[PDB]
Design a protein around this ligand. Structure first.
Ligand SMILES: [Cl-]
Ligand SMILES: [Cl-]
Ligand SMILES: [Cl-]
Length: 163
């Protein structure tokens, strides 16, 4: 565990993280994909061997000794708000199980279902709150990665709010 488990937010490419493992915002088929998933494919392509896994689940594949946790959030274009919300919560619960099993002291994590899978909605609060529900009982340092300057400010405020 980390000595004083924390949350932090950084605005940069998650492929350049300084943590002990990475969460991929994966597709169910283990394809290179776009956005975070394509950056992850360019950096850790070996981790896409047998990475396909259903919506609402996470599957870890090692690139050398570096763990890539493939977490599949729902595409809100296809799911109802209700079912999508349930699957998005479940994907983060499976990330917390994997982070714990791996015994890492730190993890780099993107906000699942906030990009191409958002069904054109702002899901910062929805996705971040499910991230906190899952990760709060873990003792890894969590570093959230984002690309937008206004999202960085809002994620930083949400972290500081809880103190
Ligand atoms: Cl960058
Ligand atoms: Cl997405
Ligand atoms: Cl972002």
């Amino acid at each position: 565990g980390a000595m004083a488990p924390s949350y932090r937010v950084k605005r940069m490419d998650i492929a350049k993280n300084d943590e002990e493992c990475v969460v991929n915002a994966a597709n169910p088929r283990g394809l290179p994909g776009d956005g975070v998933c394509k950056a992850v494919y360019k950096k850790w392509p070996e981790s896409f061997k047998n990475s396909a896994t259903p919506v609402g689940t996470a599957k870890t594949v090692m690139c050398g000794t570096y763990p890539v946790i493939h977490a599949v959030g729902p595409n809100f274009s296809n799911y109802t708000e209700s079912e999508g919300d349930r699957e998005l919560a479940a994907a983060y619960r499976e990330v917390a199980k994997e982070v714990t099993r791996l015994g890492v002291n730190s993890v780099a994590i993107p906000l699942l279902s906030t990009g191409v899978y958002s069904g054109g909605k702002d899901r910062l609060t929805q996705s971040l709150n499910h991230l906190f529900t899952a990760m709060d009982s873990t003792d890894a340092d969590v570093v959230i990665y984002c690309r937008d300057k206004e999202w960085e400010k809002k994620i930083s405020e949400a972290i500081q709010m809880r103190t």
